[PDB]
């Protein structure tokens, strides 16, 4: 590594939480050079007929993976970057300046996350991409840098991002866990196989998804549903909490202490033993009710939320997932969201999600052994993954944990 090293964030060479840096003053403010017949520009996601999308689009389908390609269409991607409080200058693409062809990007949008006994805006760096053909022009740490200076900026100095190589010391490794719904298209696109031992009809047999035991009262989520849902996801992070009731009612705002190296150190926390945290939440995203409305909706072939409503209209559990459309024919896999099992059981709610994934013309739904997903996945017909999601945090330190302790899904 020649450009991590120079970064704070822990190196593969403890058991406390807090910002590695206050350094709201020294940091770099020019904005950075490219190389000659290259420039930056702000990405207009806003016009999803612009020409800056068509690029984006057209970059990331062709060029953002480590064959098959994901897919993501403009839909998704103006839903997973065009969020409440997003800045116009954190969608950063490069262009070449004579034929202005879109050569990169890297992307971040505004959060809230909690942090054991903090609370802080900060960061989520996704969507970094370099045309397959200036690789190895140490391009990307250009774009990092210049993210880094535009989320600086804003008065933000962490940031959360994951990535499937080990970087630097990531806080928590998720891995991917899959369940199939459509055989016979995964087996024709040579996604799976038929075991040696049984047929193909035994194998879609096997493979089924239960629909002999339906929870009544599921359905979409709407508009005027997002004060039940922000109050339900409070609730379910209150239930799951890693520190007391009255650390989670007075939380140290972050934002409000980071101008001051004095001030800021507040943040800094000791940690006993590490298994104190054993299957609490630690870190997770938190979401006011203008963010319930933009995250927990409904868009075809996007995202999916649907809340379970009682006889009262109270909502009592809510599931969700996203959908990326692939290509190798074209498979759409569902991706596991944020889910609150209260009156069913977890594994009921994920029958129930599986169900309407299958109906959405899903082919597979992929889950993370984050939050409580283990309940779900063990012991299950879900198939254990390859693919292991490093998670890491810039600027703060975050002892090694648990999946299981992890509240945050990247898109
Ligand atoms: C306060 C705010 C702070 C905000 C900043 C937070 C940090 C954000 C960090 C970004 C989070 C990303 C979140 C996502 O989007 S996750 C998905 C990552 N993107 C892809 O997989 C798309 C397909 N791949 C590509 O487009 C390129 O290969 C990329 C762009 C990935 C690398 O480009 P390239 O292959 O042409 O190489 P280079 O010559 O230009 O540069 C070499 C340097 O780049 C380091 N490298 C390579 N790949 C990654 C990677 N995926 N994360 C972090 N670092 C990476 C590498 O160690 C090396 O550094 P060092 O070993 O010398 O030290």
Known sequence: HKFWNTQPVVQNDEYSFGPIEIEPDSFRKEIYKLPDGFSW???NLWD???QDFEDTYQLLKD????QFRFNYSKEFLRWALCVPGQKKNWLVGVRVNETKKMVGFISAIPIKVRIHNCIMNTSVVNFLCVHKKLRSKRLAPVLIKEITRRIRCEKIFQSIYTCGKNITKPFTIGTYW???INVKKLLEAGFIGIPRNMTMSSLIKYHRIPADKRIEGFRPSVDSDAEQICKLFENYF???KDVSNETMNNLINYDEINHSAALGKQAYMKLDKIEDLQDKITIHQCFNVEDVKHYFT???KVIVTYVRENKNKEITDLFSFFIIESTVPTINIAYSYFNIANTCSLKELFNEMLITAKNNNCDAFNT???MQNLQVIQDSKFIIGTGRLRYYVFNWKI???SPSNVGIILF
């Open 178 to 180: 899959h369940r199939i």
């Open 41 to 43: 520009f702000d990405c």
């Open 368 to 370: 993370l052994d984050l």
């Open 399 to 401: 002892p090694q944990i």
């Open 63 to 66: 060029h953002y993976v480590e």
């Open 238 to 240: 209150m239930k799951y």
């Open 298 to 300: 409904n868009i075809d």
């Open 48 to 50: 999803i007929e612009s």
